[PDB]
Amino acid sequence: DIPINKIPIFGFVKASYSYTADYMWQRSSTAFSEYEDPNGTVYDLGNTIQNSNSNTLTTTLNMNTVLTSIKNVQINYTKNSGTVLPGYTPSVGFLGTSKPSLGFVFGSQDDVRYEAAKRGWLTTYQDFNQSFTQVSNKLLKVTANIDLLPDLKVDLSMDRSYSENTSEQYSVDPSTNEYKPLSPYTYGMFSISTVMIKTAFSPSDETQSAAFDDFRSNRLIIANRLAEGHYGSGVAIPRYGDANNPIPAETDPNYAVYTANQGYPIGYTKSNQAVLLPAFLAAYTGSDASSSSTNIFRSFPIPNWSIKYNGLMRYKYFKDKFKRFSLQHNYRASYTINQFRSNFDYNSSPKVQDVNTNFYNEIIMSNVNLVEQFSPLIRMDFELKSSLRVLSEIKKDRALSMSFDNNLLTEVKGMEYIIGLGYRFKDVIF
Amino acid sequence: NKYDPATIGQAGSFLNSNIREIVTAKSGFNNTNVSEATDYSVLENARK
Amino acid sequence: DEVKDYTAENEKEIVDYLAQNNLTAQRTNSGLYYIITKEGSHPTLNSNITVIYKGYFTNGKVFDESTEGVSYSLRTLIPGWKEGIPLLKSGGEIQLFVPAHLGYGSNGNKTVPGGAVLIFEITLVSVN
């Protein structure tokens, strides 16, 4: 429970920490522990050891007891982790073990591969097909309450999710007992609360969309920034129409690609994921592409807000036929990558351009999702003194999905107008 | 083999750049006896 | 943006390496230095090549290697190779001293830092 309230300066914090650790050792079948290769050599392919972590932190952080409007700041932080190490040869004792490390048995997640290989208790088989695996999960759920005005309730929310799985095969060098990773790769998911209300009310139909036009124009700005990062301004940035990179003959395989993006830098065409992911994010968050982030991931979640305003009851509405009047406005936007993964094409080889002449990207994804929801955009709930209750609300949602498989933007737009009337005629005689 | 998409139409590939187009898919083969449902099949809006 | 100029530093490092080790290298207008140890009996921009290259830093540490022949399209490679490979024929051997702007750039990648000078020892075994 972290008794930080003992110090009479932090008597408002209500922190709470939870740590869970799991360890498991599993004996392999003798088909593995006594594997006999066709040459007759007997190999011990080892056992499998496993790890887990469930870090949790909850804080209420009562801001009470010009910024005094903040009342509560609830923070939730969950972090899960796990490790699978195959080919682990040593056994366990009656009461347990600490052989890899004492920390691993209690879910340290600190590396043990190289130490385990050095100590000589990883399998000596040189064609081991089992993979060393690590998983990680982070979930952040900051929540706040603002009281700017006496009858104005504001709720703020920040979310951020990040998962990551690593996988590699391995061997141990017969001399020096050194752990050798083989073809490591990564995949994961990312989510974060964002704000893109700046384009929420721009007209967007089959004939016009200012945000999409900005998306189109942002590509060259982002490509120029990326090229300046790659070609570090010491040389003229090579372009697809310049003297050194001429438009080929019409029979050449790359004539159409060179024609399509004539003034773009060589490794950053209009179709590069590295170009049009930040162009897309800049265009639909309303940011300037000259300074917006060219990163795939976002560190700081942008707060989303829920506003409730029962403040019109005090202007003149006491006896102005209104017996109730409230306004409500909620906003919620998220940026999501359902699946990103490492790219085996992003390696140390001299081959740096793909079939489309784009530079290889270290992290690749098929889709990115921008989802925005006004639930409600505005809700007007008022009852007249004549018992005429009205519950009107407007809902609005956008679901931009950018596919890097076909470089198409799929946009799902929705609007909902709801009006609920309630009245009671009194003493009607049949 | 010579159907390597990375070497389409280089020097001794069995495929030309026509292989990339649905309309000219048959002409995208350099080898002779190729049939539309034996050696290859085409889809236009294939779903992943 | 934090763009970085490495052209002068890379040039000075290349000439220093060419001074410490007794080698005379021809220089192109793009800043690439090459030595032709042997030639054969010319790959174009659209040509498949097979190479037994070897790549290392100025300190001699190897970052990429191919002891056996590896086939490349030569239009997908780093610019230094794009200007150095067509300088010889099948069986030829060349040594490249690629600067960063012709290599992996001011950012580099994993295992190659940004603003790094690359040395390549390339044997062109075929121009198929």
Q: What is the DSSP string of A354-384?
A: -TTSPBPPSEEESEEEEEEEEEEEEEEEEEE
Half-sphere exposure in the Cβ direction for A341 (13 Å, CA): 9
Residues in contact with A422: Cβ distance below 8 Å, sequence separation at least 6, in sequence order: A387, A388, A389, A390, A391
Cβ atoms of A139 and A112 closer than 8 Å: no
- What is the rounded CA–CA span in Å between residue A153 and residue A310? 8
Distances (CA, A) of C38 to A210, C23, C34, C97: 59, 15, 12, 17
- What is the rounded CA–CA span in Å between residue C78 and residue A361? 15
Q: Is C44 on the interface with B (CB under 8 A)?
A: no
Residues in contact with A344: Cβ distance below 8 Å, sequence separation at least 6, in sequence order: A183, A185
- What is the rounded CA–CA span in Å between residue C43 and residue C128? 9
- What is the rounded CA–CA span in Å between residue A339 and residue A236? 36
**Assigned token pair, C2:** 């934090």
The DSSP-derived string for chain C is ------HHHHHHHHHHHHHHTT---EE-TTS-EEEEEE------SS--EEE--EEE-TT--EEEE-SS-EEE-SSSB-HHHHHHGGGS-TT-EEEE---GGGTTTTTEETTEETT---EEEEEEEE--
- What is the rounded CA–CA span in Å between residue A89 and residue A44? 7
The DSSP-derived string for A75-125 is EEEEEEEEEEEEEE-----SS---SS-HHHHTT-----HHHHHHHT-B---
C54-56 vs A70-88, strand pairing mode: unpaired
DSSP code for A238: P
- What is the rounded CA–CA span in Å between residue B17 and residue B30? 10
Cβ atoms of A258 and A238 closer than 8 Å: no
**Nearest CA to CA, how far is A337 from chain B (Å)?**
17
Asked if residue A150 has a cis previous peptide bond (ω within 30° of 0), the answer is no
Comparing CB atoms, the residue among C5, C75, C107 nearest residue A229 is C107
**Nearest CA to CA, how far is C112 from chain A (Å)?**
8
Q: A418: which strand partners?
A: A393
DSSP code for A236: P
Chain C neighbors (3+ CB pairs < 8 Å):
A, B
- What is the rounded CA–CA span in Å between residue A148 and residue A256? 58
Half-sphere exposure in the Cβ direction for A17 (13 Å, CA): 5
**Nearest CA to CA, how far is B37 from chain C (Å)?**
31
Residues in contact with A178: Cβ distance below 8 Å, sequence separation at least 6, in sequence order: A114, A117, A118, A172
Domains of chain C: total: 1
Contact B9 A405 (CB under 8 A): no
Cβ atoms of A361 and A346 closer than 8 Å: yes
What are the φ/ψ torsions at residue A333 (nearest 5 degrees)?
-135, 140
Residues in contact with A307: Cβ distance below 8 Å, sequence separation at least 6, in sequence order: A152, A153, A154, A155, A327, A328, A329, A330
By residue range, what is the domain housing residue C120?
3-128
Position of tokens 């009461």?
A95
Torsion sign, CA atoms C7, C8, C12, C18: positive
Distances (CA, A) of C63 to A144, A241, C97: 50, 33, 14
Comparing CB atoms, the residue among A230, A254, A346 nearest residue C106 is A230
- What is the rounded CA–CA span in Å between residue C22 and residue A116? 45
- What is the rounded CA–CA span in Å between residue B6 and residue A258? 19
What are the φ/ψ torsions at residue A382 (nearest 5 degrees)?
-140, 145
**Residue A87 falls in which region: left (phi positive, over 0), alpha (psi -120 to 50) or beta:** left
